[PDB]
Design a binder for these strands. Structure first.
Lengths: 88, 275
RNA sequence: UCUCGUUAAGGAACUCGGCAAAAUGACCCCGUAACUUCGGGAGAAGGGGUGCUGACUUCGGUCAGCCGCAGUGAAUAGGCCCAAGCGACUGUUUAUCAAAAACACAGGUCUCUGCAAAAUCGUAAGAUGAAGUAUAGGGGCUGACGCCUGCCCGGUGCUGGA
RNA sequence: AGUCGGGACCUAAGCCGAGGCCGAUAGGCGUAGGCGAUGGACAACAGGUUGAUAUUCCUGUACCAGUUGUUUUUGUUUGA
RNA sequence: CAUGUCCAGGUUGAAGGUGCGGUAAAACGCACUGGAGGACCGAACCCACGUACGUUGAAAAGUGCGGGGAUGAGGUGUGGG
RNA sequence: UUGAGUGCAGAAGAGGAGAGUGGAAUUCCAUGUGUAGCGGUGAAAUGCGUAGAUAUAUGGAGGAACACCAGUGGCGAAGGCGGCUCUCUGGUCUGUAACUGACGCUGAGGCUCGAAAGCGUGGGGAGCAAACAGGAUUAGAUACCCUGGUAGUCCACGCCGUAAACGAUGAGUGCUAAGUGUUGGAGGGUUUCCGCCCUUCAGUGCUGCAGCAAACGCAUUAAGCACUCCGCCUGGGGAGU
């Protein structure tokens, strides 16, 4: 999916401070980008079963990080989902 | 695609019909229409010649371009349409000079394209070349027969024709229905197969609909009276007593060939395979 | 003899056959099976209320009272259920003794035909097929849908052969 | 009957068809051009009058297209 | 074939759309809107299934009482092959 | 901050989808030569051939599978993936130790994938081959052997959801002698080491000690020692009826 260009560009618009490659906000932003691009690829070739699996794994991992973010603070969680726009 | 009406009443059980999901407008050009009539199969004498015709909705003829002779002026397509006469849609084109006319709709054409039809165009869908400069292996259509007459070969929806190979004279071709021949190298043609491709996948469903298109019921043979059809007569349901099942004037129907044994083309036909 | 009205007790014993008559029939409310192509069967079945006066009418209606044997008080206005055969259905048919299980019918399949197409009307010019071009046009058999569609080319046709 | 329906307007199916293309004679078919309302397009309204007629006669108020007579701008080039 | 014309009144609710909900996006569920149909009940209209009479008839094919279709493979007028 | 994960630096691969392309071979076709056989078996026959066969030479057509490299090699969660090139795309491993601060494991119902055979719709059809036909052997042979041959085998989109789908060995994690090869790495000495030697990570095979096992055997890739979460069993038939 993405290349280091936007990979490095976005991790500075959600960086809590300088060098936040951890920071469960940044990781979920990045994963959001990548699963969007993978959704595009799947809509293009909709018989590539051996990558839809990786899509699933990424979705699950983002779900887990979100769950963890919520149970240590709420305002971060709400403010982020209002910042990224997700969670039907 | 194809709708599938939900079964509400019996005469609606398994009908099918197109979506009309690419036709852009529903208002034809004014200066391209010409009137018509529904001959209902009748001569100047006023008799039936071909049975099972006449008696449906009205139609007004659309003068399609068929020769494609304007060369070295770009042509812009603007709208696809519906046509009642042929079984394939139609596109309207504007030339830069300010003239209009129609084109058949190749399978893949879209609004906004620009088309050229000279002896030295490029080979992309829509262009109309002379048969010589079309390379080997392509799939072309609207092929002519006599140079300057227009198109009279493959013309209807979902049809293909490859070009097997040139000669010094003439060009070979694998027609649809899988039979090879050759036609003079100075005939016009355009590339790409014709448009609506599922127009064969439509189950009409009712009897009043095949009557909307101008058809008509066609009695079996073996029901008529002996003095009116060679099969008929016989009290009960009867099998064909006569050998070689017949048409109502002779000419057995199954197996019999009907070319004209002294035709003026057998020099140009290789492997009639599918008739 | 024809066209009408009424009937004790019995209620299909008449009869080739309940033919003919009798019975139901409007609006509102409750409720409704097997079966199925899931849309239907379904107005299935089987039940209840309706008049007038006053009061309250939130809005629709609810309360109280009055009379008759009978309150859509007359005319207009589906009888229903359980099984089998045929045909899928809406249509069409012998003006003037037969309206069906007959023909049509959407779908199936074989076959012909490369465009001055085959086919048909005509001695011919000329026409229709068509201002169409094999996903098109004629001819023969079968007749929605579901599961299917075995064996024989010796005989008769057709196609190919040299 | 200027005004209503039709003619002195237009055409659809169909028919006739100068030349013309075919055919024992007779004749068959067809181009140009025409004919053909069931369609298009188009200027009048109300009341009164008789034994019988009335957007026709009468009264009042109108409308269409033209012709004459005194009543207001000139190179047929064409700024008339 | 060309050109006009006629179908009182009433009922049912396909496609589609909109709004909620559910999902990572989705199949999908619920509402409101929407008005398809050789759809439904029924007059004019078009027909002709049963019966009784009539049968030198009112009539060289009807009548009375019942019956079917009724937006369509519709009915009919004028001019035509 | 040790588990988990992210950053930064590198490495390998028949991991997947889409789009084109190559040679060899079998077969049909066209032509030249060419004369009586070819093919088949334990033995034979059926069969194709003097309408010129087999053979042989030249060119054309069409579909399918990818000779050698090929290896107890590689990749994938399993089913599985091998001609070549391009566009999109997943996963694993070693190094560093920037960064968050236990975010973990397993996982009833649910959802996804799922060899071959099979069904539907539309294509395509060279070889091979259930059914079927003929020839043989046999007491009989609707079988094994031979000569033909239809669906199928291939392509697109749907459907079904099963195998001895096997290592008959659920998953996570930690501890307990050795020796020997091999795929991919990172470090250190010798160094032309890119040809040796030493240390370490990750897979992958063979031998073998404790321990275990009813024996057969397994043994850092436990069937040993232990905790957590799931599934399953309780005599053989009746019957997965």
């Amino acid at each position: 999916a993405i290349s280091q260009e936007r990979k490095n560009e976005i991790i500075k618009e959600y960086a809590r401070h300088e060098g936040d490659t951890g920071s469960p906000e940044v990781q979920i932003a990045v994963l959001t980008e990548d699963i969007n691009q993978l959704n595009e690829h799947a809509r293009t070739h909709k018989k590539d079963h051996h990558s839809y699996r990786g899509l699933m794994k990424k979705i699950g991992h983002r779900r887990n990080l979100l769950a963890y973010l919520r149970k240590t603070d709420i305002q971060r969680y709400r403010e982020l989902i209002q910042r990224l726009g997700l969670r039907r | 695609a194809i709708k599938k009406y939900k079964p509400t009443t019996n005469g609606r059980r398994n009908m099918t019909s197109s979506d009309f999901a690419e036709i852009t407008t529903s208002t034809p050009e004014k200066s391209l229409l010409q009137p018509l009539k529904n001959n209902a199969g009748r001569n100047n004498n006023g008799r039936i010649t071909v049975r099972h015709q006449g008696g449906g909705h009205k139609r007004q003829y659309r003068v399609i371009d068929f020769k494609r002779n304007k060369d070295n002026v770009a042509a812009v397509v603007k709208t696809i349409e519906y046509d009642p006469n042929r079984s394939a849609n139609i596109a309207l084109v504007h030339y830069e000079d300010g003239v209009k006319a129609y084109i058949l709709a190749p399978k893949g054409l879209e609004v906004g394209m620009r088309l050229v039809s000279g002896p030295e165009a490029d080979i992309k869908v829509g262009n109309a070349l002379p048969l010589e400069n079309i390379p080997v292996g392509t799939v072309i259509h609207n092929i002519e027969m006599k140079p300057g007459k227009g198109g009279q070969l493959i013309r209807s929806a979902g049809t293909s024709a490859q070009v097997l190979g040139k000669e010094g004279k003439y060009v070979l071709i694998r027609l649809n229905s899988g039979e090879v021949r050759m036609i003079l190298a100075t005939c016009r043609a355009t590339i790409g197969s014709v448009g609506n491709e599922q127009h064969e996948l439509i189950n009409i469903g009712k009897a009043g609909r095949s009557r909307w298109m101008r058809k008509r019921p066609t009695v079996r043979g073996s029901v008529m009276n002996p003095n009116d059809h060679p099969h008929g007569g016989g009290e009960g349901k009867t099998p064909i007593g006569r050998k070689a099942p017949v048409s109502p004037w002779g000419q057995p129907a199954i197996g019999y060939k009907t070319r004209n044994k002294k035709a003026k083309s057998d020099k140009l036909i290789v492997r009639r395979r599918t008739k």
